[PDB]
Structure 1
Amino acid sequence: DQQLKTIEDEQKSVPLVATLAPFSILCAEYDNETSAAFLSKATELSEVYGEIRYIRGDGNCFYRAILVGLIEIMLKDRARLEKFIASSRDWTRTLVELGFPDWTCTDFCDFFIEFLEKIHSGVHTEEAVYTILNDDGSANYILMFFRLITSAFLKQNSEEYAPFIDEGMTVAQYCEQEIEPMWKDADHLAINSLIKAAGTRVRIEYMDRTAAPNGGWHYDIPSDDQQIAPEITLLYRPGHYDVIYKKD
């Protein structure tokens, strides 16, 4: 059956990581006749957000969205990239010590490190980075590093996160089944782990059809007493994540 050939071909008619597009492109998916509730939320969001970056919906969208967000900060901040390149080496050692399979998990790390170093030295331009994030072989190899640290963060902190897993699964079963494999949607627990593991700070604009608090549903992860601005903002629509950008 060439059915999953056509399914995973609908997915592939869009790029992994689109170029920027005005936020009004999101509003144009909707209208007052058939999708009035979504149109309202999008139009509202467009007062704050000027642009959207569509991420392919292939099961990896959340990981790919965070990864794209992080790489964007690091193209604009040489210091932060230095810090991220080093603290990724701390992950390699963490992985191999938390008993992840050695040479395979090491090779994902090595590929990711080399990619960052090549940004740092200037070998890779901005253009070259987006091309790499759109080439399936390379982009997914890079994305695996992020699935791995998400899993590692949970295993590192297992007694703490164990009670938030349902279906009677242990943390290791959850990681093995829902975090480590590719094409697996991310849920809250995974999302919380990646953001903390990656040391980032995210606002999720939770765009659904429901009457909402002024400004729309949103979640800041982490949420703490501090009022630091989020460095990555995601658009969540039911079952899907894209990247969005405040105006100017």
Structure 2
Amino acid sequence: QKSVPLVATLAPFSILCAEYDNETSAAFLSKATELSEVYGEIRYIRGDGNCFYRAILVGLIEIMLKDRARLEKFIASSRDWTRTLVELGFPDWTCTDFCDFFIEFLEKIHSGVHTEEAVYTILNDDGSANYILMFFRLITSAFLKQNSEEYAPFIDEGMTVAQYCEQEIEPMWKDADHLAINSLIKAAGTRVRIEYMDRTAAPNGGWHYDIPSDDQQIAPEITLLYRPGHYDVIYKKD
């Protein structure tokens, strides 16, 4: 991971097997072969403690780049999270800075001033990219705090929901656990399918895991691939 950008360019799915960290097995080969019948491309996301948040924000921004109507709604909901942070007692001005930065970025996409290329440059600039990522940590924490009664059962014996957020969600470089993953996706109002290279890693014990657990027939709008140390964005063949 020495050389790797925060957000890679699109690569053909077949090149996934060229990565040296993959298990050397016919089992891995076979699963990748199966997936290659469905998925045509893969976009690598830097596999650090921010990876899951980053893969989701990339997937979301890609949707917005193709749909201004969705982008308008997402800007409005991001503005409303800004209000909600203040209501839930988040430090006002420090948190508002991150909200304002992310919203200004989205507004510039919406205006048409940013090209696709300009957006991918911003998403690869450590400064800008981490400010944007912080907004997603904040709304994940806000969602948990807002629904604290509902999610308290899932928190380890020792702590409150607020403590869990302060320790496991709000800090940068803290890997998202199962609860954080669910909270982010609900907070962002999206629908994600995670494909697993190894079914043992799946929280639902399935080859894929759809979040949120709906039961409703609605296609996921972001698909990720999980391998040890990696969440990468993957794209269905047309």
Question: 2:226 and 2:168 mapped to 1: Cα distance?
Answer: 19
Relative to structure 1, the CA distance from residue 80 to residue 211 in structure 2 (aligned partners, 3 Å threshold; closer, same or farther) is closer
Superposition RMSD in Å: 2.5
Report the Cα distance in structure 2 between the residues aligned to 1:153 and 1:213, rounded to whole angstroms. Answer: 21
Shift of 1:34: 2.8
**TM-fit CA distance, 1:95:** 0.3
Distance in 2 (CA, whole Å) between partners of 1:212 and 1:56 is 21
**Equivalent-residue separation in structure 2 for 1:213 and 1:144 (angstroms):** 25
CA distance, structure 2, for counterparts of residue 214 and residue 177 of structure 1: 25
For 1:84, the equivalent position in structure 2 comes to 74
Q: Give the match's secondary structure for 1:16.
A: coil
Structure 1 outlier segments of 4+, above 4 Å? 30-33, 209-216
CA contact (8 A) 1:23 1:52 kept: yes
Deviations 1:187-218 (A, max 9, x none): 11001001101000000002217599999711
What SS does the corresponding residue of 1:210 show, helix, strand or coil?
helix
Gaps of 5+ in 1: 1-10
Q: For the residues of structure 2 that align with 1:33 and 1:92, how far apart are their CA atoms?
A: 43
Aligned partners of 2:199 and 2:205 also within 8 Å? no
After TM superposition, give the deviation of residue 238 of structure 1 in Å.
Answer: 2.4
Q: Output the CA distance in 1 between the equivalents of 2:222 and 2:54.
A: 12
Instruction: Give the direction of change, closer, same or farther, for the CA distance of 1:217–1:172 in structure 2 (3 Å limit).
Output: same
The one-character-per-residue Cα deviations of 1:81-135 (angstroms, maximum 9, x if unpaired) are 0000111111000001100011110000000010000000011110000000000
Provide Cα deviations, 1:215-241, integer angstroms capped at 9, x if missing partner.
Answer: 971100012232011100011112421
Counterpart residue number, 2:168: 178
Give 1:27 shift.
Answer: 2.2
Query: Aligned residues: percent identity?
Result: 100
Contact preservation (8 Å) 2:185, 2:211: yes
Normalization by structure 2: what TM-score? 0.94
1:96/1:201 CA distance change after superposition, 3 Å: same
- TM-score by length of structure 1 reads 0.90
Alignment of 1:51-70 (within 5 A): 51-70=41-60
Task: Name the SS of the counterpart of 2:41 in structure 1.
Answer: strand
1:31 is displaced (CA, Å) by 11
Q: Secondary structure at the match of 2:162?
A: helix
Distance 1:169 1:13, change over 3 A: same
Contact 2:193 2:222 in 1 (8 A): yes
Q: Tell whether the 8 Å contact from 2:10 to 2:42 is kept in structure 1 after alignment.
A: yes
Cα distance in 2 between the residues matched to 1:188 and 1:215? 13
Contact 1:60 1:183 in 2 (8 A): yes
